[PDB]
Amino acid sequence: SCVLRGVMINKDVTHPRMRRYIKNPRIVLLDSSLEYKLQMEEEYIHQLCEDIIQLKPDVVITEKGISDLAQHYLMRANVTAIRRVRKTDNNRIARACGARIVSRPEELREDDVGTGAGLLEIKKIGDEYFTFITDCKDPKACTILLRG
Amino acid sequence: DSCVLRGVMINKDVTHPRMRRYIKNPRIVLLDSSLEYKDFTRILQMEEEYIHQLCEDIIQLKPDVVITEKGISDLAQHYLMRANVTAIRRVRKTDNNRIARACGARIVSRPEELREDDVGTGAGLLEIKKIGDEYFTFITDCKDPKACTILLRG
Numbered sequence A: 001s002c003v004l005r006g007v008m009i010n011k012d013v014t015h016p017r018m019r020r021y022i023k024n025p026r027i028v029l030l031d032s033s034l035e036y037k038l039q040m041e042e043e044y045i046h047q048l049c050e051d052i053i054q055l056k057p058d059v060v061i062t063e064k065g066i067s068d069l070a071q072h073y074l075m076r077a078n079v080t081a082i083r084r085v086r087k088t089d090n091n092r093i094a095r096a097c098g099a100r101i102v103s104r105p106e107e108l109r110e111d112d113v114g115t116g117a118g119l120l121e122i123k124k125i126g127d128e129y130f131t132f133i134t135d136c137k138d139p140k141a142c143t144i145l146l147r148g
Numbered sequence B: 001d002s003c004v005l006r007g008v009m010i011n012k013d014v015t016h017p018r019m020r021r022y023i024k025n026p027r028i029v030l031l032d033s034s035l036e037y038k039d040f041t042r043i044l045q046m047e048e049e050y051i052h053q054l055c056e057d058i059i060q061l062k063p064d065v066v067i068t069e070k071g072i073s074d075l076a077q078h079y080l081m082r083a084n085v086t087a088i089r090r091v092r093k094t095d096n097n098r099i100a101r102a103c104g105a106r107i108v109s110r111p112e113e114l115r116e117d118d119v120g121t122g123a124g125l126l127e128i129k130k131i132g133d134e135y136f137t138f139i140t141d142c143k144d145p146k147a148c149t150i151l152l153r154g
Helices: A039-053 A068-076 A087-097 B040-059 B074-082 B093-103
Strands: A003-009 A021-023 A027-030 A059-062 A080-082 A117-125 A128-136 A144-147 B004-010 B022-024 B028-031 B065-068 B086-088 B123-131 B134-142 B149-153
Touching (some): A027 A087, A039 A068, A087 A128, B028 B093, B074 B086, B093 B134
Parallel strands (some): A027 A059, A059 A080, B065 B086
Antiparallel strands (some): A003 A144, A117 A128, B004 B134, B004 B149, B123 B134
16 A cells, blocks of 8 residues: 555656556567668668567667667657666666566567566656656565655 | 655765765755865865854754755865754755755855745655665655645555
8 A cells, every 4th residue: 555666767768759658568678779780771770670569569678779760660669768778777677577688689589578567657757757667566576666 | 645755856865974864854954055165274274264154154053954056065064964964965956946845945045144934844854765776865745735746656
């Protein structure tokens, strides 16, 4: 009753058209870049996104950057994206939702998708936006944000 | 409406790890002025006389917490701790204004002007909590029910 568990990080969606409130979100976690690594480069980005999108996630979070083009494709697939997340926060999110941090998108498996967190809500507190991943199925998987 | 936290939350820690980090009904003083100072012995003496008077002006009001938008020097931190005062430096102007509305204090520019009316007694709790890798200061339990927004809902 008088308590709240979950992860809180200082981040916002990369693009304003993205959903900031998602119930039972399917979460994909990466530690790799979604930027070129212009015609052959543009095709590269397309395929990177295609591999993520095949898994029908609601949220894609990476420790690196996301180019304006990758953001666009994910946006078209109704996917909320968050970039430049600290490695420690990414692991906190992995524990909370049961996702597996993956490097190469083409190696993604349905087993890597996190479905253990019931809420993803991004809201403004003061001057900044905070991302909350709450409603953990495994109570133990999340730390306490509020105790009466 | 059940398990609701109202107040202000700012990304800040105290200036010294051993200051009180949990205070019920804190008396709050807010400033937008510097608590820094700008023959070697003569210099030290001048810096000291200046900082001493500054801290004395503040200490006279028996505050539990002193928060400013600018800096707080080691000597100032030393004199405020001798008075059992918890201090927070470099808070943003926007956050400082939110704290003012939450606790009723007036942000003052010149400590010598300080009076009881300037002391914020409106918030019932100040607490610093570590969330993830960051420290956050929670000023909550607003006495005026129309002063604060919802931070967290349980």
